[PDB]
Each structure stands twice: as structure tokens, then as C-alpha cells.
Amino acid sequence: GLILKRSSEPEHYCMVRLMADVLRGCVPAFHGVVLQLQDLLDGFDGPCVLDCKMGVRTYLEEELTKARERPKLRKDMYKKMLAVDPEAPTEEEHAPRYMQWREGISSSTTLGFRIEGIKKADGSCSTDFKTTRSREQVTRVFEEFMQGDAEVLKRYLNRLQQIRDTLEISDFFRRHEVIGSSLLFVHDHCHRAGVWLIDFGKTTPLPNGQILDHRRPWEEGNREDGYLLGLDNLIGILANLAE
Numbered sequence: 001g002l003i004l005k006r007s008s009e010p011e012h013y014c015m016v017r018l019m020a021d022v023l024r025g026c027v028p029a030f031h032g033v034v035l036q037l038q039d040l041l042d043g044f045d046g047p048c049v050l051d052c053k054m055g056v057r058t059y060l061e062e063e064l065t066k067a068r069e070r071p072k073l074r075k076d077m078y079k080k081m082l083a084v085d086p087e088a089p090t091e092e093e094h095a096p097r098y099m100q101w102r103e104g105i106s107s108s109t110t111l112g113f114r115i116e117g118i119k120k121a122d123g124s125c126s127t128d129f130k131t132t133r134s135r136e137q138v139t140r141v142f143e144e145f146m147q148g149d150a151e152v153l154k155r156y157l158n159r160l161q162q163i164r165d166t167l168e169i170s171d172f173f174r175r176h177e178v179i180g181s182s183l184l185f186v187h188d189h190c191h192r193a194g195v196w197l198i199d200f201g202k203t204t205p206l207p208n209g210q211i212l213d214h215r216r217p218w219e220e221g222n223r224e225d226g227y228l229l230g231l232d233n234l235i236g237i238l239a240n241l242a243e
């Protein structure tokens, strides 16, 4: 039971180091370049899955610089910033920003994480959470996803606390930008449950010896991502649901 990504570099490398970091248990086991990863669904019966995009900012600060010169005008995304609302400029109307617009209507800006999608035992799938922003709304999606199973919620919380601790002493995590990865929640009707970090497509190293705090606000040079601020809240939201 395995899975093959489509190997990119910041990820292969992100993987060649995680299998050597204290975070090894918090991510899919990596199995060389024969990308050969562990299938996190293999141990469940009818897998229920929820992918949480963790972070205050969802684009590499570097993608913003490189974007300051060359334009990336995709007309599809602007079909996106319109059919949702008129917030779009007269310049856009007639011709990163999308992502940072997505962060505000979403939950990434007010609590560093955002629900990307869900898969059920057989309720198929949904990615319709673009405006899920408030804490009450986040809980509602989680509350439904769990279906009253308190044993699953207990296990998800215990794992989040354990992940949080590992992240705080991880030197790898410490020396990196990490943007666009997710916390993938998985559980089944057998009460089985697990949580892992995935997506190391973005995630880059900082200057010689420089480190990130992962909780303070981002400013042009910070390269800060607010990842732990997102985890602090996600845990907060699940601990209250536990009542």
C-alpha cells in the first residue's frame, strides 16, 4: 500500500530531511526515488478524510517578488474573483493577489489554517469551503465530519497536541518557510483515527543559520508563515467541540 507524488525538488529534498528529523512520525513514510510515499488511507475501512491547508499566508514570499516583475494573469482565477463577488480591480476587470483574496474570504488570515476539502465513507467528496471563515463555521464542518464520534475527536486532539510538541523542537521545521502543506485528518467507522503533515511542494530553507518563529505576523522579509498560529487555533476549535 503506497502512492507516487510527481517528484518536484523542494519536496524530494523536504522528504530526504524529514525522514531524518524528529518529525518523521508526523509525515508519510518516504520510500526513496524508485516519489514513493506511504498511503495514509491503507489502514482504514471506509476512510473519512479532511484536508486542512495550514498557514497565515499561502504563497512563497519569493513568488511575490518574482511576481513584482513578470505577470502570472491566468483568466480562470479572475473568473474565480468575480463569480464570487465584485471585489476585482477595473484593471483586472479589463485585462498571489488571488491567493491573498482567497485567504481573507477563507479562514487562512484570521486563524492560520483553512479547510480545503473532505471525503466521506461514501458521501463522495466536497471542496466547497471557500467562504468557511469563522470559528463557528469551522467547528460546524468538523462537527459534521465526525458525526458525533467522541473517540475519534479524542484521538485527533491527542495527535494534534503531540504534533504541536514535535513541531516546536524540530530543527528542520525551524529552518524553513513551509507554505502550502496540509494537516490531513483520517478516520473510519471503527473509531480509528490519524493526522499527518503532507505537501512539501512549497517549504524552503531560510538564510545562513536563520530561524523562523512560525507564530508572529508576516512582513516583506519575515518569511514568517504563521503555521503554529494556525495549529494553536485548530486545536482550540477541536477542544471546544469536545463539549
Ligand SMILES: Nc1ncnc2c1ncn2[C@@H]1O[C@H](COP(=O)(O)OP(=O)(O)O)[C@@H](O)[C@H]1O
Pocket (backbone or CB within 6 Å): 003, 028, 037, 038, 039, 040, 041, 049, 051, 182, 184, 198, 199, 200, 201
Ligand atoms: N501519502 C498520502 N496518502 C494518502 N493520500 C494522500 C497522500 N498524500 C496526498 N494524499 C491526497 O492527495 C491530496 C493532495 O496531496 P498534496 O500533497 O496536497 O498535493 P498537491 O500539492 O498537488 O496539492 C490530499 O489532500 C490527499 O487527499
